[PDB]
Symmetry: C5
Subunit: 217 residues, 5 copies
């Protein structure tokens, strides 16, 4: 059903060039105004996240999605023209596209969650060549191992050929330690034998842009 709708999704991570000015009046309002105008074009900002402290080279993440990649490219450059954007250096910006699963929470469920963890993913070279039953069993068993974490909202979106990775993953939860515990628990899944890359991790706190701007150095 919702697999026939096309939705590109972009996670854009920035770090402070140094700090924001002591007088940062208008910084958040300008960005909120941009986000409001993007919403008129059905470009959705799902959240802005404070990453500072949890990573030395990242401070802010924007999660935005739209029907086309071009809309998100325009949004990205318009953000970089804001006063806040001009105080930031781009760090990591990766797009993904909802594709039908072989055997999406952000489109079905918009209720806010306090924390997020985002990371890219690359499977082993053998993974897509395995017998269909191997991959089906392993993807099924990781679902069963995740059933104890219904409070963690999981997104896994295809990114082949949009960048350096195969999937981008995003986990949303109201309690940060539940993301930690989920990830630790899934280390016991057999699919862990078929992983090549899963960093960088960008983890932080969802905040409204006003509070986000006020809190950054």
């Amino acid at each position: 059903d919702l697999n026939e709708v096309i939705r590109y999704t972009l996670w854009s991570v920035f770090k402070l060039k140094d700090t924001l000015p002591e007088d940062r009046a208008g910084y958040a309002d300008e960005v909120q105004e941009l986000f409001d105008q993007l919403a008129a074009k059905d470009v959705t900002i799902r959240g802005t996240y404070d990453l500072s402290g949890l990573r030395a080279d990242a401070d802010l993440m924007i999660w935005w999605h739209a029907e086309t990649a071009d809309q998100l490219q325009e949004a990205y450059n318009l953000f970089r023209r804001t006063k806040l954007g001009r105080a930031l250096e781009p760090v990591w910006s990766n797009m993904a596209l909802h594709r039908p699963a072989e055997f999406p929470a952000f489109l079905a469920d918009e209720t806010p969650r306090n924390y997020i963890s985002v990371y890219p993913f690359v499977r082993s070279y053998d993974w897509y060549l395995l017998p269909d039953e191997d991959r089906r069993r392993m993807l099924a068993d990781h679902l069963k191992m995740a059933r104890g974490y219904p409070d963690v909202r999981a997104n896994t979106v295809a990114s082949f050929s949009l960048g350096d990775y195969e999937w981008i993953l995003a986990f949303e939860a109201d309690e940060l330690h539940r993301i930690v515990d989920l990830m630790r628990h899934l280390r016991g899944s057999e699919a862990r034998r078929h992983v090549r890359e899963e960093i960088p991790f960008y983890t932080g706190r969802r905040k409204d842009i006003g509070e986000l701007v006020a809190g950054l150095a």
Copy 2:
């Protein structure tokens, strides 16, 4: 016979372009026009911004000699736009006969591009000829469902850090994604060492491209 070198040059903004960027695109378009008189072809300029944090612009250009493309590259870096950009990745390749090119036979424009380098496993070129022939033929068979994606694979041994540069051009971006996902099922995936960075973006005329960058 027909020697053609092909170069993909990727740049990122030093910061942003000035608010008043009048003449930035015109100067570059004038340069591309003069290069055309020298049979240096700009196949396209592409907006990479947003899809990568450390890249904003790609130029795909080709010529009969590498020297012509080096000259073109330096002339571009002297333009106002070139002086607002930092070089990120610039890699040349050369059309060579296949063991067992669409960018020269087909010039019709496509909306989107994906460019990435490629390095095979150490033993790939040592496998029995029939093994390579079989896997290369089977990846052709698997790509049959995507005739709307125009593929180029160009040899780059000794021109840089890689063995091949690949470029995929399509009017619908999701078709490039779907092709790449589908070819993950080819046995040739067992003989791969490197395939990044990926540079994917939207083909734009230089005026619109310059206007849209931060």
Copy 3:
């Protein structure tokens, strides 16, 4: 089962501090005092300089929530000292239940007595480690404890960091004699768990110092 987030934040000098650095340390100590009043604990500040070309200072701070540590981090970056520094590596973790013991208090909350030196590094196990039969992992973890019994003067901290950053665990070792940390690490190269390691760098090692003497001694 009490949640405590712990953060190690590493910085390097942009250049040097000014010849006149009056009030640099005082401003930071005042911030640390205000944070302590809000139950944000600065366990230590450490001089890393010289032992690493790209690091000079580390702060170990911990609190009930990640958010409190994010606020502390940004407030530190606003100090004069903070504005003279470039962030290098900042990684958070928290104690979670061990697989094979019933301890629920991490060592750093149980023992806060001061130690002269520290070594901090992240850790990532082999892909197969958590897939091994339980008894194998139990045995190898038991053996690394047994091999560490000759080093009771090295205080060890093991805290989970899955999904908070690029790693699985953050480890910290606190000792009054720096060579005892070296000798411990060398000795544990004989543990079979070494066959199940993927990543364990960067190492940030240095001398615990009061912020006044730390600021005075930096270039």
Copy 4:
């Protein structure tokens, strides 16, 4: 046998533009040529200067120089960095090798193009039975015989830097270097390789034309 007894250190130094050379760059090339002339009088040979621009984003210029001692090449390197051209450049990669038991001593005839890269063999390569190493180095020689127009240099660099060998290929037709390298992918020695990048490929140019053509 006057070949593998004469001592010769060889250095490949790669630079990139900090940004761009000035529009008025008169005297830049002449100052460098004057230095090269003074170095030749001290038996420091500049085998070539090469335009790498465009073929790599982080490289514009390479100098290949060689001398009887490493110290002479260190002096040459620093003197170049004091020229106006040198002060407009940032060092990128500079690696020395030492001729141990090469055509850069037997053949001075210019060639239009160069490809330079470092090399590290598998950990067990030097532990293989001598027959295996003899066979593979011999077969790889056989595979290169169709490319006599490509001049090959392989120079030991153990302990001078991060590598085991530095390789340099010189040819008048750039496509012949490409074709040689592709052909040698069929050599058994390819099973015993750990590292072979960065590649620095470019066009040999006199310093005047090189300086005029850089951004």
Copy 5:
């Protein structure tokens, strides 16, 4: 018996002044003041040209890590220090060998000057310290035997576990640079080469007095 040793590598931010009078004198006076406090500067080395991202290395050692940290920061306040960017600085100390009873590191026993140096860090394979003791003893004995043809290359092996990213820092001092090259090539035939994970960066250069070193840098 405890002696920490530190190798600190720097690169020029750009160049030194054309008139750099006083640069070397200030550093030499710092070295003299440090020697009065039993902080030894074993050598300063010109790395330039042999590496694009390094120009100067200092080998210094002292009874405590803290003394070397102070020395490092004091050097960074000199005019020369302020013209340099730190690149790589790694500390180590001699610890008892597994299979010999020597307790004095070579660098404390022999300080006669040598023209050239090669310094690099080292990390063994994950299984190396898990091998049967006899296998490790045999391979270490064989690498000593293969080095017997190079008595003119002075070797130091110091432990660096937990002080940085490595297990050992190695230093080789010789009057003829080609002898270091030849030693390393020869030891590629040792069985211990099957048990290596990391051995770069290599910092190789010429020992110089600080005056001539400063004079020769760009």
